[PDB]
Amino acid sequence: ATTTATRLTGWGRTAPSVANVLRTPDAEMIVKAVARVAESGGGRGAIARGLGRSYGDNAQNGGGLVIDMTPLNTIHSIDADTKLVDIDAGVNLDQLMKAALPFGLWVPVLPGTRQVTVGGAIACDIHGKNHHSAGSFGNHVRSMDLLTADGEIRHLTPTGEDAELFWATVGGNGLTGIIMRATIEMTPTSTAYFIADGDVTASLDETIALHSDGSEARYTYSSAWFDAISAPPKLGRAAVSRGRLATVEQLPAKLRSEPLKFDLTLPDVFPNGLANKYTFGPIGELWYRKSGTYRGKVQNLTQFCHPLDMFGEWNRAYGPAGFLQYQFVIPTEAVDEFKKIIGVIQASGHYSFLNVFKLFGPRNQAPLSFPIPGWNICVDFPIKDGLGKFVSELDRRVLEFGGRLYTAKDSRTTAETFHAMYPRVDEWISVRRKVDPLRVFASDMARRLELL
Ligand SMILES: Cc1cc2nc3c(=O)[nH]c(=O)nc-3n(C[C@H](O)[C@H](O)[C@H](O)COP(=O)(O)OP(=O)(O)OC[C@H]3O[C@@H](n4cnc5c(N)ncnc54)[C@H](O)[C@@H]3O)c2cc1C
Ligand SMILES: CCOC(=O)NC(=O)c1ccsc1NC(=O)c1nc2ccccc2s1
């Protein structure tokens, strides 16, 4: 065990605050610190911290305690018959994925990076490429052990007594207490590969049409890269990547002897950089269209889920240092309003190169869960004069159109905007006050967003 004064930021490397960081692989030492925060006064409290991949301020607590959960990383059991994994909250999804593949089990929700803790995944109720077919992370938790303000460990499940606290903890940003341990139901798989279809659209209207033609129901996974810089009609054109997990019959013979195995970058070889005389004219368009259009292509995890790994030190000049990540969802029916927000973005003078578009499916019952059925987009803006004031206008537009921002990608929204975006906030706050009357759990985010 060590306790250290530490300057913490989120992944965006902004809004720094100093906290006493506790780092111990001893679960009883964690209980004792919480018990101490609870007994001695009220104070500025405590917040859990995972791998620090949230862009915002939800895993810091200026002048209070931060409990680093990463050394609690025991996988206790995996069972192929029940499909259940029992894991400490500090286990990460990369570690879990590799540990579970030999059992023919797949992590049911994967984010854009595997460097996230199980606790972080639950507390942000993370989503991925299969949201429309599988929901978000919290949908797959069968039990969790929550260390609450009174220093007891409550065993929470999604149904029966304490369901309310379970669903307040899902997406609760650590503010109901410290998840120590959890059971996740995994997805059975016979391979570590995807079968994928690719389509490339010419415009925004084409991108939308493809996502509302009914074809989404044929694919368990689906996401798109999105042009946010070009003027219409090119604005909102997309490289759409859709697929499902392959079965072993669908693999080529060379891969069929290790169906479950998990298997030198572009800036090193074919760089610097990628452009030629063709790239920005009609041949480049044709090439782009033809290489992004395919059917029944076998891909590994890296190809299908982390296609940004191909580019190397190039993903350093697109974040995170002088960059502001911004993610929002607009309800399905507000299609015209979605197109309107995209127009506002391209004409703003703020140029976002990397844009992830996805159509979300049904929501779950967590009051603070980000995803709702509708048009989800993530953008990444260079930090520049006027950006802060422009994203405030974006906030207003998102709110007006019935949508919301993601707390994992936010450090600059107001309490007022957030509360209007999350109309079940009062219901959630009221659960939080029942389980933490003394405000033992607190973070910079809780104070900024008035969730304390
Ligand atoms: C490159 C990149 C790609 C990403 N892609 C996606 C994506 O596709 N989809 C998506 O949904 N998200 C995505 N994210 C966001 C990320 O998945 C979430 O922010 C996730 O919560 C971070 O997990 P973490 O362990 O780093 O948690 P941290 O960032 O350390 O903490 C996040 C929150 O979880 C809480 N928390 C952490 N551990 C515990 C615990 N043991 N008990 C209680 N509360 C806890 C913290 O208190 C904090 O409120 C991405 C982030 C990056 C940097
Ligand atoms: C679709 C896979 O995309 C990625 O490779 N992710 C990235 O590298 C990346 C880098 C910084 S932020 C980020 N990705 C994201 O924040 C993503 N959000 C969603 C939402 C739904 C479906 C897929 C994604 S990926």
Residue numbers in the entry: 6 to 268, 273 to 461
List passages from the publication reporting this PDB structure.
Mtb Decaprenylphosphoryl‐β‐d‐ribofuranose 2‐oxidase (DprE1) is a flavin adenine dinucleotide (FAD)‐dependent enzyme, which together with decaprenylphosphoryl‐d‐2‐ketoerythropentose reductase (DprE2), converts decaprenylphosphoryl‐beta‐d‐ribose (DPR) to decaprenylphosphoryl‐beta‐d‐arabinofuranose (DPA), an essential cell wall component. Multiple covalent and non‐covalent4 DprE1 inhibitors have been identified and showed in vitro and in vivo activities against Mtb, further validating DprE1 as an attractive anti‐tuberculosis (TB) drug target. When analyzing toxicity profiles, we noticed that many TCA1 analogs show inhibition of CYP2C9, one of six major cytochrome P450 enzymes which determine the clearance of 75 % of marketed drugs. Here we report the X‐ray crystal structures of WT DprE1, a TCA1‐resistant DprE1 mutant, and CYP2C9 in complex with TCA1 analogs.
Y314 resides close to the carbamate moiety and it was previously found that a spontaneous TCA1 resistant mutant harbors a Y314C mutation. We measured the inhibitory activities of TCA1 and its analogs against DprE1 and the Y314C variant and observed 5‐ to 40‐fold shift on IC50 values under the same assay condition, which is consistent with the MIC shift between the wildtype (WT) and the mutant strain. We also generated a Y314A mutant and it is sensitive to TCA1 inhibition, suggesting that the side chain of Y314 does not directly contribute to TCA1 binding. To elucidate the molecular basis of the resistance mechanism, the structure of DprE1 Y314C bound with TCA1 was determined to 2.2 Å. Although the overall fold of the mutant enzyme is identical to wildtype, consequential structural changes in the active site of DprE1 were evident. The most striking difference between the WT and mutant DprE1 complexes is the 180° flipped orientation of the boomerang‐shaped ligand in the active site. The alternative orientation of the ligand can be linked to the effects of cysteine 314 substitution on the orientation of Lys134, which positions the ϵ‐ammonium group in the void created by substituting the tyrosyl ring with a thiol. The reorientation of Lys134 is driven by formation of a strong H‐bond (2.75 Å) between its ϵ‐ammonium and the thiol of Cys314 and results in a noticeable shape change of the active site around Lys134. Consequently, the acylcarbamate keto‐oxygen in the original orientation would clash with the alkyl moiety of Lys134 (with the shortest distance at 2.7 Å), which likely weakens the binding of TCA1.
